[PDB]
Each structure stands twice: as C-alpha cells, then as structure tokens.
C-alpha cells in the first residue's frame, strides 16, 4: 500500500490496479519484467486479477489471469505462475528463469524415498498423518491428474492461504506442508525462527520453472526469450537472487 501523503508509488514499486483502487506491486518478477521491457523497449499497463487467481480448469472453463489472456484482456500474464501441458497448449510460454516445482516443507522430526507411499496412504500408518496444499493450484490439478487418492484425502487438509497454510504447519495441528519449491525454499531461508526446512536436498519432482503467458503462435515471442537469457547472460539474476530470493536461514546445517 502506497504512502497516502505521497499519493503515488515509490522507488522500484510499479503501479497495478485491482477492480473491486491503486495497489503498488514490487519484487523479483516486477524487476525482471522491467528489465525485459527495458531491453525490448516497449511500454505496458499492469493490473491485478480478480477472478480465480492462478489459472484453473473447472469443468469446461478456465479461470484466472489465463482468462484475461484468452479474453485478450491481457496479452501476457506475469507472476509466480507454474508451467503445465494444458496451458502450454493454449498459450505460448517463456523459458523458465528459476529452478522450482512441487516440494515439501516440514519440521525436524521423513520420506527418504519421497514416493514411499506413506503419503499414498495415511491409513497404513495407525496414527493419522497430515499433509495439505493450496487449492485451485497447478499442483492440485496435477495431483488430481496423476494421483487421485492423494487429492481426495488432502481436500480436508487444504488451506486458505500460504500464510495460513503456514499457520497449520507452524502452530501444530499439521505435520507436513506441500507447495511450490521456490516459495518453500525462500520460506525455508526466511522464518521467524529456523523451525522450518525443505524435504531432502529440496530436490523437487515435477521439475519446472516460472514461465510467462503470451497469446498464441503470433506474438513478440522469441524476442522475449532472448531478453531473458541476456538477463542471466550478464549475471544479474544471481544478484537479484541474493537480494530478493536469498533467505537468512539454512545457512546452518
């Protein structure tokens, strides 16, 4: 929220509007967008999504930013958006800038195989086990696609928001949490106490990266992609990683 006395956004923050009010968006993705735009030299308008957050297929119809990409209300959608076959099918995606994916975040008390099926069934273990993830996610859709039982069981353990999901992990009443690997790693690094850690080496299955939406085969397309690898090409991403992504935790281990 921008300083009311100032009346307009400050520093790195770039304006974004949400139909319901001007909100000020800033961060890693914002800086990357700014650099890409700077390199390709174009101007752009940024706003916030209302309906359905991250893109989701419900029954026949899609939701989220992807809708505004399909409705041509957005040309390109930017964010923490993960990549999947369906969305790559409907819209062309930028190359992944960061190593991420599905992953687990748990307290120091579990799955070395990490496919051990201890997750597959809670019931095999006499005490009830617990793990959950945020709904309407690429993670949840993927889960439902490959592993049904896990979805049907985890619906009870689904949580409202990442801060709240964190509330279920942190205060007890939940054992394990599952979410995006970049977010889980940054949260591993950033915690009020170093009470939370990643799973194994944090080496994630469903190895993926964050992409960016475009309409279809007709688009600025390749021009974007080049820009992206110029960003790492000059080594900026490492600096931006140290500033935005690097957490203080996990130094110790």
């Amino acid at each position: 929220d921008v300083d009311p006395l100032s009346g307009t956004c400050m520093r790195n923050t770039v304006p974004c509007r949400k139909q319901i009010i001007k909100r000020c968006c800033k961060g890693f993705c914002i800086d990357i967008l700014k650099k890409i735009a700077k390199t390709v030299k174009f101007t752009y308008d940024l706003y916030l999504v209302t309906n359905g957050k991250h893109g989701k297929k419900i029954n026949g119809v899609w939701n989220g930013m992807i809708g505004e990409v399909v409705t041509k209300r957005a040309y390109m959608a930017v964010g923490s958006l993960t990549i999947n076959e369906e969305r790559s099918e409907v819209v062309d995606f930028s190359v992944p800038f960061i190593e991420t994916g599905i992953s687990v975040m748990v307290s120091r008390s579990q799955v070395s195989g990490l496919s051990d099926k201890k997750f597959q069934r809670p019931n095999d273990f006499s005490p009830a086990f617990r793990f959950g993830t945020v709904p309407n996610g690429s993670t949840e859709r993927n889960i439902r696609n490959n592993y049904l039982e896990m979805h049907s069981y985890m619906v009870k353990f689904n949580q409202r928001s990442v801060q709240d999901a964190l509330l279920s992990l942190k205060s007890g009443k939940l054992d394990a949490f599952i979410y995006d690997a970049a977010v889980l790693n940054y949260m591993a690094g950033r915690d009020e106490g170093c009470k939370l850690v990643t799973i194994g080496s944090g080496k994630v299955f469903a190895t993926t990266g964050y992409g960016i939406a475009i309409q279809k085969d007709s688009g600025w397309k390749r021009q974007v992609d080049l820009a992206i690898l110029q960003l790492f090409g000059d080594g900026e991403m490492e600096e931006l990683e140290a500033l935005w992504l690097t957490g203080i935790c996990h130094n110790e281990k």
């Binding site: 999947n84 076959e85 790559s88 099918e89 696609n145 490959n146 299955f205 469903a206 190895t207």
Partner: protein, 94 residues
C-alpha cells in the same frame, strides 16, 4: 585451466582416479553417472553454467511444435523421473 589439458573424457576421469590430477571440471550429465559408477570420486558444489538439453529441429519444421507439446506431457506424468531413475543407477554412493 588451459595448462595440463586432457584430450578425452576417459583420460580426464582417469587422471583423478590415477590421482595424477587433483580436480576435474566437466558438465554434470556426463560426470554424475561416473560419480555413481565409482564413488571413489565425488562431484561437488552447485551446477553452474546451467544449461538444459533438448531435441534439435529446423524452425521450419512444425513437428517440433508437437515434440515440445509431447515433452511437457512426458514431464507431468513423471515419465522422465522414472527414466532418469532407471538410467541413473545410482547403485552405490552417498
């Protein structure tokens, strides 16, 4: 690095194995499999000069459009994970 260069991969791994050379630098995909193969030798640090592999096609050929479309479909189901699991043994090392 230019000093004391080796001609081929086998000789380069051998030097470290022979202990002729204390360290060897190469991309992981060739190296990690060997790391599993001996375990007398180890890989260290974080992959740098990160580069992803892929199947080459001319821009003019549209089949690649399906290929990527297929590649992604192969990623989601964990087909790749099981294939790396098969071909990376992975038998003895830690």
């Amino acid at each position: 690095m230019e000093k004391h260069n080796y001609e081929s991969a086998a000789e380069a791994i051998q030097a470290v194995r022979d202990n002729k050379l204390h360290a060897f630098i190469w991309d992981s995909a060739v190296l990690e499999f060997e790391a599993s193969q001996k375990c007398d030798l180890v890989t260290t640090g974080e992959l740098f000069f990160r580069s992803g592999f892929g199947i080459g096609m001319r821009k003019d050929s549209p089949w690649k459009q399906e290929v990527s479309l297929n590649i992604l479909k192969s990623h989601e189901n964990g087909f790749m994970e099981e294939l790396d699991k098969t071909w990376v043994r992975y038998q003895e090392c830690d």
